[PDB]
Design an enzyme around this catalytic site. Structure first.
Site, PDB file in Angstrom:
ATOM      1  N   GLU A 132       0.853  -1.218   0.000  1.00  0.00           N
ATOM      2  CA  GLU A 132       0.000   0.000   0.000  1.00  0.00           C
ATOM      3  C   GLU A 132       0.878   1.254   0.000  1.00  0.00           C
ATOM      4  OE1 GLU A 132      -2.860  -0.271   3.118  1.00  0.00           O
ATOM      5  OE2 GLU A 132      -4.370  -1.141   1.747  1.00  0.00           O
ATOM      6  N   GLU A 220      -6.193  -7.190  -1.272  1.00  0.00           N
ATOM      7  CA  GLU A 220      -6.720  -6.939   0.064  1.00  0.00           C
ATOM      8  C   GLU A 220      -8.056  -6.229  -0.028  1.00  0.00           C
ATOM      9  OE1 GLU A 220      -5.625  -4.040   3.641  1.00  0.00           O
ATOM     10  OE2 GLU A 220      -3.865  -5.231   2.980  1.00  0.00           O
TER      11      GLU A 220
END
Length: 296
Positions: A132, A220
């Site tokens: 991320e 995710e």
């Protein structure tokens, strides 16, 4: 043994045909953070046999406290889950789970080179090289690091899928689509969403990205708020599942873990040996099992 994964234009293919897989992300692997107890062959086998999961994601913490940069045993947790996914005929993501991956480039290259060397002949393995990124530039922060790490993996493992993180907690896939990584085989781009925080405006950016020819993979997603807290957004999660199935987008739910937060699939104390019954699944875990068990 499992079908090899490739990409072609905006599709992620399995044995050369359109399709997708659903499964589970473990929580951070970091020592002391409580998700480590699920990094084992019994939990992996149970997700396969009881949830019909096709995928597990080993979320190896890097620069956070108790991560791989200070605690070498994080890598052992990853190889335990990789070996078990192979033993159970499941795909497995090896995820360099950092918000600052470009700052640990030599460590990331060394790590992915060791993985590609040990595992690159197994169709099961998928490399996720930057969980991320934050609010940072695609062209000037992520893409140059992603290119460097991909060059090194592809010298050893010419084929297995690499999935590349995108700006703004892996939301900005439309930015990557305007400047894609070209020339390397089987590269997809990360989209993360949390149904309590993200809805139609994020699907719109994913639609733009797919329209511009890039393949996406949801490494995710959660049914709760983006911070892992809060209530399950059942209806918004359904809209996202519809979108994923429409576009054959593979996906891993966060998190297979028993911390007292909304995103945890399991109620606190749920056995590390697996075998969970209905009441050991949280609202989020019940919904994720439903989606994963039903996946085409």
């Amino acid at each position: 043994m499992v079908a090899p994964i490739t990409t072609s234009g905006n599709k992620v293919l399995f044995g050369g045909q359109q399709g997708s897989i659903a499964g589970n992300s473990f929580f951070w692997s970091n020592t002391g953070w409580g998700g480590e107890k699920y990094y084992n062959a019994q939990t992996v086998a149970w997700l396969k046999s009881d949830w019909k999961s096709s995928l597990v994601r080993a979320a190896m913490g890097v620069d956070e406290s108790g991560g791989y940069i200070t605690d070498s045993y994080n890598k052992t947790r990853v190889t335990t889950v990789v070996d078990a996914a192979i033993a159970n005929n499941m795909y497995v993501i090896i995820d360099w789970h950092s918000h600052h991956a470009e700052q640990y480039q030599s460590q990331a290259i060394a790590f992915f080179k060791e993985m590609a060397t040990k595992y690159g002949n197994n169709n099961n393995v998928i490399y996720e090289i930057y969980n991320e990124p934050l609010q940072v530039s695609w062209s000037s922060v992520i893409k140059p690091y992603a290119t460097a790490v991909i060059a090194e993996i592809r010298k050893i493992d010419p084929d297995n899928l690499i999935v590349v993180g995108t700006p703004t907690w892996s939301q900005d896939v439309d930015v990557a689509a305007n400047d894609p990584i070209t020339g390397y085989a089987n590269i997809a781009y990360t989209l993360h969403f949390y149904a309590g925080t993200h809805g139609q405006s994020l699907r719109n950016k994913a639609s733009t990205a797919l329209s511009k020819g890039i393949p996406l993979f949801v490494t995710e997603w959660g049914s709760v708020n983006a911070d892992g807290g809060g209530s399950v957004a059942t209806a918004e999660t359904n809209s996202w599942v519809s979108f994923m199935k429409t576009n054959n987008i593979s996906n891993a739910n966060w998190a297979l873990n028993d911390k007292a937060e909304g995103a945890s699939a399991l109620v606190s104390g749920a056995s590390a040996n697996g075998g969970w019954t209905s009441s050991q699944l949280t609202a989020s875990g019940t919904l994720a099992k439903s989606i994963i068990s039903g996946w085409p």
